[PDB]
Amino acid sequence: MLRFAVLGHPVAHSLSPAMHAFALESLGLEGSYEAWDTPLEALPGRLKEVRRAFRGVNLTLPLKEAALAHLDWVSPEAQRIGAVNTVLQVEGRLFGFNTDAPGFLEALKAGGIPLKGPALVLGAGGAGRAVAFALREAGLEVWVWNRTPQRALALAEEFGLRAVPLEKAREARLLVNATRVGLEDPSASPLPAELFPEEGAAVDLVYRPLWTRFLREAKAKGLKVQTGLPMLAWQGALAFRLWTGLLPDPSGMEEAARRALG
Amino acid sequence: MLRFAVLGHPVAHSLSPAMHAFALESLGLEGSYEAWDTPLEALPGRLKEVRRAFRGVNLTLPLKEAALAHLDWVSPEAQRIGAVNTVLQVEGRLFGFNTDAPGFLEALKAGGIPLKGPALVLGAGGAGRAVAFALREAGLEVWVWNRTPQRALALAEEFGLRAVPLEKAREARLLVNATRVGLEDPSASPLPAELFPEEGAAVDLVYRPLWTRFLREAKAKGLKVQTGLPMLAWQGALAFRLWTGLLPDPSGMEEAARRALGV
Numbered sequence: 001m002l003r004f005a006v007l008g009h010p011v012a013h014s015l016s017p018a019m020h021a022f023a024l025e026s027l028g029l030e031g032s033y034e035a036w037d038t039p040l041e042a043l044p045g046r047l048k049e050v051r052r053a054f055r056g057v058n059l060t061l062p063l064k065e066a067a068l069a070h071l072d073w074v075s076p077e078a079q080r081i082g083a084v085n086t087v088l089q090v091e092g093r094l095f096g097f098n099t100d101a102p103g104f105l106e107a108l109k110a111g112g113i114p115l116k117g118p119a120l121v122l123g124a125g126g127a128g129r130a131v132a133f134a135l136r137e138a139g140l141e142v143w144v145w146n147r148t149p150q151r152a153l154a155l156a157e158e159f160g161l162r163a164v165p166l167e168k169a170r171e172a173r174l175l176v177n178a179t180r181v182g183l184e185d186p187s188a189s190p191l192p193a194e195l196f197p198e199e200g201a202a203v204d205l206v207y208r209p210l211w212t213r214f215l216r217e218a219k220a221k222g223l224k225v226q227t228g229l230p231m232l233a234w235q236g237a238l239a240f241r242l243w244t245g246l247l248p249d250p251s252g253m254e255e256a257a258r259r260a261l262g
Numbered sequence: 263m264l265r266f267a268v269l270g271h272p273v274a275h276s277l278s279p280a281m282h283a284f285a286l287e288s289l290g291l292e293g294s295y296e297a298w299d300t301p302l303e304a305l306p307g308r309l310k311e312v313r314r315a316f317r318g319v320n321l322t323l324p325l326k327e328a329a330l331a332h333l334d335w336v337s338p339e340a341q342r343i344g345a346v347n348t349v350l351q352v353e354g355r356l357f358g359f360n361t362d363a364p365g366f367l368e369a370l371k372a373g374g375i376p377l378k379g380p381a382l383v384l385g386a387g388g389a390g391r392a393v394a395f396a397l398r399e400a401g402l403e404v405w406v407w408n409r410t411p412q413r414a415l416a417l418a419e420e421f422g423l424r425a426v427p428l429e430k431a432r433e434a435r436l437l438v439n440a441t442r443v444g445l446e447d448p449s450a451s452p453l454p455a456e457l458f459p460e461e462g463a464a465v466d467l468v469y470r471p472l473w474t475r476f477l478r479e480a481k482a483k484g485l486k487v488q489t490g491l492p493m494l495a496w497q498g499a500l501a502f503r504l505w506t507g508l509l510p511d512p513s514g515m516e517e518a519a520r521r522a523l524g525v
């Protein structure tokens with residue numbers, strides 16, 4: 001019993017299998033969590049397959065947004081965010097949820113990052129929307145920026161936030177990189193060093209490398225920093241509870257993910 | 263800790279607490295399944311407490327119908343049957359399902375009884391509906407009877423069945439008692455021995471007593487028979503799987519009920 005898996009392309013190096021293997025073991029449960037490559041056009045087929053033999057699955061790039069028109073139910077939050085990262089299967093019916101939003105908040109709390117705004121979310125893409133949704137719910141004043149202005153402006157209107165220029169980063173107290181800038185690229189950062197504030201906190205959703213240029217610039221400025229692992233771990237832990245009713249240890253899953261990275 | 267419960271009025275004799283206690287223990291899980299007396303007045307206040315402190319709950323009379331309107335999502339089957347016996351709580355949201363229909367079918371399969379029709383369901387009430395529904399989806403011909411002809415003909419239309427006179431029971435190959443006849447009445451049966459099928463099988467949903475006059479008659483005639491416990495055990499095991507993803511041993515679920523019954 002308990003067949004799980006992460007669907008997306010690519011997923012060859014996902015850290016979920018390692019995290020969830022630990023979750024199952026730690027809770028004394030038998031089961032498996034496997035990495036299963038799935039293009040955005042091979043999705044319809046896989047949701048059918050999930051229905052017949054998986055208790056649940058995580059969705060990742062680039063399936064998160066397209067999965068909605070494919071589930072029997074989608075949570076109010078997942079719908080607002082417009083993306084599902086966790087699917088539960090019961091009686092062949094599929095229910096979509098988003099554990100990225102609540103996971104991010106739990107990660108901040110657990111990591112001792114104060115919820116102090118204004119919070120600037122860099123990136124109005126999928127991850128940016130989930131983070132902006134979470135920070136709005138937490139009641140902070142939220143600003144959003146995007147390389148392409150329209151997307152930031154549209155999101156600001158949609159969520160009742162404020163689209164701002166990169167320069168306003170100096171006035172933010174919580175900075176979140178929700179862009180792909182820096183992914184596998186130690187030379188790139190979404191924010192020029194000179195625009196970082198001198199007090200506050202910075203979080204990077206990118207965890208490859210672990211200490212991105214963005215986090216190094218932030219740490220250099222004396223800001224409290226958090227890597228992308230805590231969020232990854234919490235969204236996974238919350239997903240596991242959705243599936244079984246049990247909450248595996250988040251710190252344990254994070255460590256497991258770290259060990260899995262090398 | 264996993265928190266479960268059976269909601270209804272009454273529930274003091276429900277065998278669910280005993281069955282799920284076995285499920286939890288046998289599956290090495292920590293948690294509890296309690297019986298919570300819940301009159302219809304209190305469904306609202308009760309469900310809210312569910313969204314907050316329970317992973318899932320079973321619903322028994324008289325809350326199986328008035329629950330649908332209060333849930334965030336109701337399964338199709340449960341929609342068509344018009345009753346929910348299993349509620350799942352996730353992120354404060356409540357989802358309703360009916361494990362009786364599939365539990366009934368899985369009990370027959372696991373017990374040997376072939377889904378060879380034509381099958382006749384005696385009783386067009388709540389119990390009969392769930393069973394009538396499950397049997398056609400299974401792929402066999404299904405007739406329905408009821409002491410009040412109307413309640414039967416209407417069901418034949420709503421579910422695409424066929425209302426028949428009691429005499430038809432003889433031409434059926436699958437007999438199902440969905441009436442309260444025989445409940446704590448060893449000498450009472452809804453079907454006269456003379457109207458019993460020629461070949462086939464019979465299943466009684468009444469499990470108190472376990473061997474009802476209906477089942478004893480059916481057996482004397484040469485029909486294969488099944489008590490009401492296998493269905494009880496499977497709807498419970500399926501409910502547990504629904505809440506956790508793990509299926510407790512249905513045979514063990516039945517044993518637990520048997521012991522709780524003391525027979």
Ligand SMILES: NC(=O)c1ccc[n+]([C@@H]2O[C@H](COP(=O)([O-])OP(=O)(O)OC[C@H]3O[C@@H](n4cnc5c(N)ncnc54)[C@H](OP(=O)(O)O)[C@@H]3O)[C@@H](O)[C@H]2O)c1
Pocket residue numbers: 061100122123124125126127128146147148151177178179180181183190204205206207228229231232233235
């Ligand atoms: N740690 C976790 O658990 C976690 C959870 C979710 C996401 N993430 C990570 O965060 C990132 C975002 O993922 P996602 O699902 O939101 O998907 P995504 O859709 O692939 O990201 C599109 C977004 O990234 C920005 N971006 C891309 N290239 C850029 C460049 N060269 N310069 C400036 N901005 C650029 C986009 O700007 P435009 O709109 O202008 O293209 C936009 O805001 C990924 O690296 C992902 O691994 C991590």
